[PDB]
C-alpha cells in the first residue's frame, strides 16, 4: 500500500529559452566611444604644449651659458 504517486505539488520548470538583458544597443553605443576618445585628445595640447614650454625652458639654460 506504500507506493509513490503524490497527490499534488508540481511546477513545472520551463522549457522556455530567453534572457534578453540588453544592454544599451542601437546608436547608444559608438556614442560613449567617440566622446571619450576626443576627451583623451582634449587632454593633449594642455600637456604636450605645456611640456613644449618647458622644453624651450630646458634649452634656455644651455644657450644662456657657454660663452
Amino acid at each position: 500500500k506504500q507506493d509513490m504517486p503524490p497527490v499534488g505539488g508540481y511546477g513545472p520548470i520551463d522549457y522556455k529559452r530567453n534572457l534578453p538583458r540588453r544592454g544599451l544597443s542601437g546608436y547608444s553605443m559608438f556614442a560613449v566611444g567617440i566622446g571619450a576618445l576626443l576627451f583623451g585628445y582634449w587632454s593633449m595640447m594642455k600637456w604636450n604644449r605645456e611640456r613644449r614650454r618647458l622644453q624651450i625652458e630646458d634649452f634656455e639654460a644651455r644657450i644662456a651659458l657657454m660663452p
Binding site: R52, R53, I56, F59, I63, M66
Partner: protein, 80 residues
C-alpha cells in the same frame, strides 16, 4: 548607390570603417587654423647658439641689450 553603403556595412563591417579613417584624415590638416601654429612653434625652438653680428654705421634695429623690445614676439605662447 545609396543602398551600396547599406548593403556592404551590413555585409563586411571592417574595411568600411577603415575607409572612413582613410577619410577625415587627409582633409582636415588643410582645414583648421590650429595648423601653422604647428609651424610657428617648430621653427621657434632654439637648438644652436644665436651668434651676433658686427655693426658698421647701421644699426637698422636690435642693439646689444637682450631684454629690449628689439626683436620679434614669440611670447604669445606663454600667454596662450
Amino acid at each position: 548607390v545609396a543602398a551600396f553603403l547599406k548593403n556592404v556595412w551590413a555585409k563586411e563591417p571592417v574595411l568600411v570603417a577603415s575607409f572612413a579613417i582613410a577619410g577625415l584624415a587627409v582633409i582636415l590638416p588643410t582645414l583648421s587654423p590650429y595648423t601653422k601654429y604647428s609651424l610657428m612653434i617648430n621653427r621657434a625652438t632654439p637648438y644652436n647658439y644665436p651668434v651676433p653680428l658686427r655693426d658698421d654705421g647701421n644699426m637698422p634695429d636690435v642693439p646689444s641689450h637682450p631684454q629690449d623690445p628689439q626683436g620679434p614676439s614669440l611670447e604669445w605662447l606663454k600667454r596662450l
